Amino acid sequence: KPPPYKHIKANKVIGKVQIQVADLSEIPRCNCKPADENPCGLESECLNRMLQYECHPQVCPAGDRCQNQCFTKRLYPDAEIIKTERRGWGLRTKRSIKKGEFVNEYVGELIDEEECRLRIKRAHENSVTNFYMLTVTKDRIIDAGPKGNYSRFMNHSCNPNCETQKWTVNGDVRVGLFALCDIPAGMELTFNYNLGNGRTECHCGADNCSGFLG
Numbered sequence: 001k002p003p004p005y006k007h008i009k010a011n012k013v014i015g016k017v018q019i020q021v022a023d024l025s026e027i028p029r030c031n032c033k034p035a036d037e038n039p040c041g042l043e044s045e046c047l048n049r050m051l052q053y054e055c056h057p058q059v060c061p062a063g064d065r066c067q068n069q070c071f072t073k074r075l076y077p078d079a080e081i082i083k084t085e086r087r088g089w090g091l092r093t094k095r096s097i098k099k100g101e102f103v104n105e106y107v108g109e110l111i112d113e114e115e116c117r118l119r120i121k122r123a124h125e126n127s128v129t130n131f132y133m134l135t136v137t138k139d140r141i142i143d144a145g146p147k148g149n150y151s152r153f154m155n156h157s158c159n160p161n162c163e164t165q166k167w168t169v170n171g172d173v174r175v176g177l178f179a180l181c182d183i184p185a186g187m188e189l190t191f192n193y194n195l196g197n198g199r200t201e202c203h204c205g206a207d208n209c210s211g212f213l214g
């Protein structure tokens with residue numbers, strides 16, 4: 001292979017965008033216990049999980065047995081870039097992934113709406129057909145094109161195996177990819193994109209494919 005990009009670990013703010021960090025006092029504390037099985041885990045009633053808030057290890061009553069630290073720990077299932085025939089480069093998981101498990105964080109440059117329009121405009125002028133913009137809110141957009149991680153390679157599907165979720169982590173809203181089903185080793189990882197009047201024909205191959213991305 002793909003053209004170059006900078007492989008980065010965390011989002012990078014651009015221009016007027018600033019990252020909002022919580023004071024420790026502002027991070028919510030859940031009611032989970034060190035003596036629960038799988039504290040703050042997928043099965044649990046964790047109040048932080050419910051609201052898509054990541055626990056902070058200095059706040060959580062389960063301390064370091066807390067299973068709600070996925071963004072901060074940066075443990076992603078090992079993945080691999082693949083070449084497809086009609087959807088460019090994509091991404092496959094090397095190993096099996098369980099339903100609801102954290103797959104990756106969608107990282108990139110954090111830009112505002114005006115910057116995003118400017119990049120889309122420049123891209124169209126240079127006949128670029130690959131876009132990597134994901135809306136966090138109307139005026140906060142992650143562009144994983146110049147800089148990102150492997151999540152930038154996940155193609156669109158009309159019947160995806162992953163979905164995006166917006167999580168609050170230490171006071172900042174971040175975007176994670178999570179498995180919608182049990183995914184076997186070797187499967188291409190996809191999500192349903194959301195995303196001007198530009199449409200790209202879809203080659204996802206799903207039975208419910210609309211024909212366009214998204």
Ligand SMILES: C[S@@+](CC[C@H](N)C(=O)[O-])C[C@H]1O[C@@H](n2cnc3c(N)ncnc32)[C@H](O)[C@@H]1O
Nearest residue numbers: 087088089129130131132153155156202203204
């Ligand atoms: C975020 S990138 C995904 C990785 C990209 N395939 C690459 O080669 O770098 C998004 C671009 O991939 C293409 N793409 C992704 N899913 C597709 C699909 N299902 N059908 C056709 N093109 C797709 C479109 O060009 C889209 O703008």
Ligand SMILES: [Zn+2]
Nearest residue numbers: 030032040046
């Ligand atoms: Zn908890």
Ligand SMILES: [Zn+2]
Nearest residue numbers: 040055060066
């Ligand atoms: Zn916790």
Ligand SMILES: [Zn+2]
Nearest residue numbers: 158202204209
């Ligand atoms: Zn499709």
